Design goal:
part of a larger assembly; 7 chains; A mainly alpha (257); B mainly alpha (40); C mainly alpha (286); D mainly alpha (480); F mainly alpha (48); G mainly alpha (32); D: 480 residues; mainly alpha; 24 helices; 3 strands; F: 48 residues; 2 helices; 0% strand; hydrolase; Proteosome; 26S proteasome non-ATPase regulatory subunit 8; 26S proteasome complex subunit SEM1
Amino acid sequence: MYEQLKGEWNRKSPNLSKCGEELGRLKLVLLELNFLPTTGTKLTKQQLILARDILEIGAQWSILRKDIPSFERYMAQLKCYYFDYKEQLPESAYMHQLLGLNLLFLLSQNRVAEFHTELERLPAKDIQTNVYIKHPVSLEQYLMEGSYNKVFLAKGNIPAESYTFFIDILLDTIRDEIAGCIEKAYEKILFTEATRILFFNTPKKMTDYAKKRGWVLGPNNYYSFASQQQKPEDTTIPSTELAKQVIEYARQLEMIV
Amino acid sequence: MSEKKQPVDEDNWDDDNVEDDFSNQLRAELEKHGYKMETS
Amino acid sequence: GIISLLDEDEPQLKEFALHKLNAVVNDFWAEISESVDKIEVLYEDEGFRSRQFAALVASKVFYHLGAFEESLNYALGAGDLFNVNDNSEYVETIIAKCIDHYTKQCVENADLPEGEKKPIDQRLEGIVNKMFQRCLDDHKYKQAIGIALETRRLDVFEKTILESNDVPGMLAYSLKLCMSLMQNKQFRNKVLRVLVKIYMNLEKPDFINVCQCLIFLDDPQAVSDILEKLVKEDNLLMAYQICFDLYESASQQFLSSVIQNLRTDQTLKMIKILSGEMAIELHLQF
Amino acid sequence: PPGGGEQEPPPPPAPQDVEMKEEAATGGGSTGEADGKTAAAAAEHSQRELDTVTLEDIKEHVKQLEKAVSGKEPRFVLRALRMLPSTSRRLNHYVLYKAVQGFFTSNNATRDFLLPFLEEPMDTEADLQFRPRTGKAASTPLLPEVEAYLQLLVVIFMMNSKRYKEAQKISDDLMQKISTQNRRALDLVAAKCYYYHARVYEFLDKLDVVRSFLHARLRTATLRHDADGQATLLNLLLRNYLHYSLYDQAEKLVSKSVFPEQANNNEWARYLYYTGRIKAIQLEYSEARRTMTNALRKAPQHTAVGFKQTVHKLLIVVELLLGEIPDRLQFRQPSLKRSLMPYFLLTQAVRTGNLAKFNQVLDQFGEKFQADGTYTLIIRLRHNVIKTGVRMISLSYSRISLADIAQKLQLDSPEDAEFIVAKAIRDGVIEASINHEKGYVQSKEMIDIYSTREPQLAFHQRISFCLDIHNMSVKAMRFP
Amino acid sequence: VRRAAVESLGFILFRTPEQCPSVVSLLSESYNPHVRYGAAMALGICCAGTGNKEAINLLEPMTNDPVN
Amino acid sequence: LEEGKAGSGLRQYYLSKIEELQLIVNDKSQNLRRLQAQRNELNAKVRL
Amino acid sequence: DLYSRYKKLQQELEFLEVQEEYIKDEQKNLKK
C-alpha cells in the first residue's frame, strides 16, 4: 500500500524483485475497486492520480529493459487514462515525452496509417511548443518528400531522453527497405556505393549485409542477382469464368418472370 | 432539403482553362518567343 | 484497452478484466471482434475459474457480428449463468432461435424414432417451465401451451393441463385447435387420447369430445365404458343424446363393433337407438 | 396598430385554412394506407417529410398569433378518436374548435404552457392504434419548440418533450407495430430530434450518452429488419465520433455495418462524404477521391446550399494530394466568394514551384483553415509540393536522364533525385522504371491490350446494372 | 386426368370455402374447356350451400361459354 | 404486473414473429396480381 | 388468440406461394 512512488526511480533500477513489487502494485490498484465509471469524487480520483503515475514509471522501467509487448501494454492503459470521460485530472509533467515514446514506437513498426490518425487528438501542441512531440512529426515530415539524410543528420540531436531503443529499430527498418530496393535487378556496385547509399565507411556493417543479404565482394566488385520472375501467362485463363458470366446473363433474362 | 452540414455557403468569363495551363509567361510572345533569333 | 489485461497470466486479473467486458460490450462492439480467439482460448481451459462467463461475453460479441449459431453454441456452454438473467432484449432473441432450432430438431426426430437422434441440452426446457412459472404469475396459460403443441412433447402438455385449477373449458378450447389447424394425424391421436385421460379425471363428460375423438380414434370399448358410467350414475339425458349424435356422425362397422361391446331396460333402450331404427322413421315421418 | 395592426388580419386565415388542411390530408391519407395496403411507403409520407424539412419550418416559427398555429395546441388538446362514437364526436370537435379558432381567440399558450398542452394530447383517451397520429403530431410541434431559438429553459423542455416522444417511440417498438411500421417515419423523427439534441449536448456536456442509446437503438433496428433504419442511425452515430477531435477513426475502420443498401438518393450521398473523409485521414487517397467524387455528383439538387460546397471543399485537397485540379470557381455564389479565395490561391502556389508563397498563405489563411477543420494539409501536402512536378515530368517525357531532372525540379542534385523518383514509384505515383546503369529514367510501354482484354471487365457491371433496372422496374410495376 | 386434378380442389378445400374463389379465379380462364369444366365443378363442391355471390359472379361467364 | 411482465415475455415472442409473416403475405399479393395481369395479356394474344 | 393467428399466417403464406407457382407455369406455357 503506497509502495515506493520514487523508490529506485532517480538513481538506478537494477531491480527484478521491485519488478515483482510493481507486479504486486498492479495487483493492488486494479483490485481496489475499478476505474470504469469515473463520475466525480476527487477522493476516488486520488488513486487515479497514482494509477497514472505507477504506469508512467512502469513505462519508464519497460523501456529501461526493452520489452516490446509490455511497452504497448502500459502505454495503452496510460492512453486509456487520457481516455477518461470526466478528466479533471491535473497535468502530469511526464505526458508529452510519454506520448513521444508512443509516437516514436508506432512510427518505428510501420504503423504509418495509425500514425496520422493518432495526431488528431493533439489540438495545437505540435506547432506552439512541445519538442518531445515536435521531433517525431518533424521526423515523419523528413520521411515524406525525399530527405533520407536529414533524418540521419538529426540523429545526433534528441532533446528528450535517449530514444535509442526505438530509433535503432526505426533506422533498421529504413536500411532493409533501401536494401529491398537494391536487392532488385540493380546488378553490381562497389563498397563505395554501399558507403554512399547505405552508409558507413568500413565497420562490420559490410559483414552484416554479407551474411544477412548477399553482396559478395569479388574482384573489387559486388554481386546482386536478378530478382525478376518469368511471368507465366496464357491470357485465355478466364475461358471458364467468362463462360460462367454469360450463363447468368440469360439466366437473369429468362427464369425470373 | 437541409442536410445540417450547410452553414457557411470577358471579365473572368472563361479564364480558368487559360489560367490553369498558362499563367504569366511573358504573354506579349515576342521578346523571347519571337526573339530567339539573336542567338543564331 | 483492457485486452492488455487479458494478456497477463494470473486469474485475479482475469475476473476483473471480464467484469469490465460485459459492462461495456454494448458500446465498444468491434474492439472485441479481434480478441475473439483470446476468449475462445480462455474458454478451452478446464482450470480457468470463469470459463462459463467467457461463453457469455463471446455470445455477446457474436451477437454483434451476426454469427447467431456461435452465440447459440456458447449459450450452450454458458451454464446457468445465462438463464439466471431473464429481463433483457438480448436474452429473448437468442432463446428465440434456440426454440426455433429445437422445434425443427424434434420434427426431424419425429421422423426417426428408431434411435439415431441427437444429444439435446436441457436448459431449453428449463426455460419452458420458467415460462410456465411466468404463466403461473400470468394466469394466462394459452401461451405456454402453444410451444407445448409445437415442441412435440406431451408430458409437459399433461403437466400444463394438470396445472393450478382454472377451467376444464380451456382444455376444451385447446381441443378445438385439434379440429381446425391440426395438420398431421400421426401424433394427433396421441394428443386426442391424452385429452380423454384427463376427461376421465374430470367430473363431467362432454359431447364434442367423443364426437371428435373416438370417431377419429375408433375405440368402441371406450364409449361403451363411459356410457356405462352414464348409466351408472343414472344419467339417461346425455347418454340418450350422444347415441343420436353417434348414429348421425359415425360410419358402418363401428356401430357394429360398439354394439358387440354393449352386451359384453336402459340396455334395451340403447340397443334400439344405436341400431337407430326409430330415428329413421321419424325422419321419414317429417 | 394602424400600420401593422391592420395588417394583422391577413396572416392567420389562409394558413388557418390551407396549412390546416396539410396535416388533415396527411393524417387522413397516412391512416388510409396504414389500414389497407399496409405497404405504405408510397404516400405523402415522403412529401410531408420534405415539407417538414422545408415548408412547416418556415411556414411558421412562432405560433402565429390571432390563432393560426397558436390555435393548434388547444385544437389538438382534446383527441380521443377511440371508438366509432369517440371518432365521430371528435370529428365534431374537428368542426367546432376550428370554427372557434377561425373566429375568436382560444387558449393561447405563452410559449411555456406548450408542455401542459402536450399532456392532454398524450392524455384525454389517446390511442395506441393511431401511432402515426401520435408520432407525427407530437414531433411536428417540437420544431416550433426548438426553432423559437430563445434557448433558455425551453432547452430542458426540448429535453423533456423529446424523451416524451421517445418513450412513446420505444414503447411502440416494444408494443408490436401491426402492419404500419412507423420506422419509415420514426427514422427522420429520430434524426430531427437528435440534430438539436446534439446541439443541446453541445450547449451542455458531451453526447456519448446519446451514442450509448443509439448503439442500443441501432441494435433493435435491422435485427427486426431494415426499412431506412440502419441507414439513418449510422450517419447519426458516425457524426459525433467524427465531430470529436479525439482518435475516433479506427473505431470507424472496424465499424462493419457498411450495408444500408438503399437510401432514397439522400442518405447515401452524405454517407459517402463521411467515409470519404475517413479513408482520406488514413492516407488512402485513390479510393477516397473517387467516392468523394461519387458523393458530389449524386445529390447536388439544391440552390447554393453549402454542404455541396463542403464536399467540393475536401475533394480539391486530396486531388492536390495527387496532383490534378479542375476549374473550381465556375459556379460562384454570394457566399462562395468567401471560400474560393484561399483554395484557388492554394493550388495556384502548388502548381508553381514556389514554397515561400505556400508558407505565406498558410500564415495568411490559416484561420480560415481553422474554421474548415483542415489543419493537416501543411504536414501532408508539402510531400506533393515536390511530387507534383515529378508526376508532371514523367507524364510529359518518355525516357529522361536523371541528370536533367535535377535542374527541371530545381533540386540541384542528381544523387537524391534518384530517391524522390524511387519514392514516387514506391507509392505508385508513376508506373515508370529506372535504368541504374547509365542514368536513364524511362516511362512505361505503349498503349497495351486495352483494346482487347480490358473492356469486358467494364461491360460486366453495365449488363448487371441495367438489367437490375429492368428487374426493379418490373417488380414494382402493378399496384392495382 | 387434367379434369380430375381440377375437380379434386373442392374435396380438399371445402372446409374453408373462402380460398376457393381466389384459386379457381383463373382456372376458369384457361384455353381448353376441360380445365374450365372441372373448374366449374370445383366451385360446385367446395362451396356447398353458401350464398357466396363471388362464385356466382364467376359462374356467370361460365354459363355463357362458346363450348357447350 | 400479471400481464405486463408476460406481454413482453410470452406474447412479444409471438407478435414480433407474426410481423414479418404479415409482411411477406402483404408482399406476395402485390407480386401475385402482377403475375395475374401478365398472364391475362398473353392469353388475350393467343386466344385472339 | 395469438397462436391461432400465427398458424393461419403460416398457412396463407404457403398457400399463395403455390398459386404463385401456377402463374409461373402458365405464363411459361403461353409463350410456347
